[PDB]
Design a protein around this ligand. Structure first.
Ligand SMILES: CCNc1ncnc2c1ncn2[C@@H]1O[C@H](/C=C/CNC(=O)c2cc(-c3ccc(F)cc3)cc(O)c2O)[C@@H](O)[C@H]1O
Ligand SMILES: [Cl-]
Ligand SMILES: [Cl-]
Ligand SMILES: [Mg+2]
Length: 213
């Protein structure tokens, strides 16, 4: 029995079916009162909410679903017709994410893609009929933010005004990612200082808006 299974079970027993906000609240309560887990959390979540509301993206890609917290958080704020694609390499977590989305009633807005980002990203145009992405949320292995950003560019999946939003740029940190988006004339960057999920360690998100090549 895993921590991730316990979190799902807690949501299933306590949250309100088909109520995404109640699902987020139940996850936050579990992590506040029981076991910590690497969800973006409430504090950084408020920033994520503001970005989704501001830019109203039609197609979002999330890298790293884990238990589905960020998928629920983003999908609940998408406009009618808008869609989220979330990539997750670990099939146990992909199964948990699907059950979370099902409970939240968000399953028709979200598609879980099984596998590693480096293998799925190059298939998005052909296999999954994507032209370009409006937003990308990065929250997977921290040394893969830079390589995947470069792969997204190479594959032609970013357009002028595509918003990249990256978690954990301070803790654990994504220093190479930051040096790249901040140094590159291809991105205009904003830093959002906040706190690591479920504690008071300073962490932040970076918003990097693609400008074209
Ligand atoms: C191989 C790269 N491509 C990938 N493609 C698809 N899914 C991927 C990928 N990498 C990782 N994943 C999945 O993303 C998730 C992993 C995320 C990594 N997150 C962290 O390490 C993380 C870690 C912390 C943290 C912070 C402070 C600490 F003291 C200890 C840990 C905080 C966070 O908010 C984090 O996001 C898992 O579900 C994993 O299976
Ligand atoms: Cl929090
Ligand atoms: Cl736009
Ligand atoms: Mg994170």
């Amino acid at each position: 029995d895993t921590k991730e299974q316990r979190i799902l079970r807690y949501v299933q027993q306590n949250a309100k079916p088909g109520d995404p906000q109640s699902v987020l609240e139940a996850i936050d309560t579990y992590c506040t009162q029981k076991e910590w887990a690497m969800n973006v959390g409430d504090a950084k979540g408020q920033i994520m909410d503001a970005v989704i509301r501001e830019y109203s993206p039609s197609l979002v890609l999330e890298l790293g679903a884990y238990c589905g917290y960020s998928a629920v958080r983003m999908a609940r704020l998408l406009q009618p017709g808008a869609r989220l694609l979330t990539m997750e390499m670990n099939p146990d977590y992909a199964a948990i994410t699907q059950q979370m989305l099902n409970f939240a009633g968000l399953q028709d807005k979200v598609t879980i893609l099984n596998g590693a980002s480096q293998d799925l990203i190059p298939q998005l145009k052909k296999k999954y009929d994507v032209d370009t992405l409006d937003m990308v949320f990065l929250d997977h292995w921290k040394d893969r933010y830079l390589p995947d950003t470069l792969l997204l560019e190479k594959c032609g999946l970013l357009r002028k005004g595509t918003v990249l939003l990256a978690d954990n740029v301070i803790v654990p940190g994504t220093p190479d990612f930051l040096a790249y988006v901040r140094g590159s004339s291809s991105f205009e960057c904003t830093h959002y200082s906040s706190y690591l999920e479920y504690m008071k360690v300073v962490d932040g998100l970076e918003k990097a808006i693609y400008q074209g090549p």
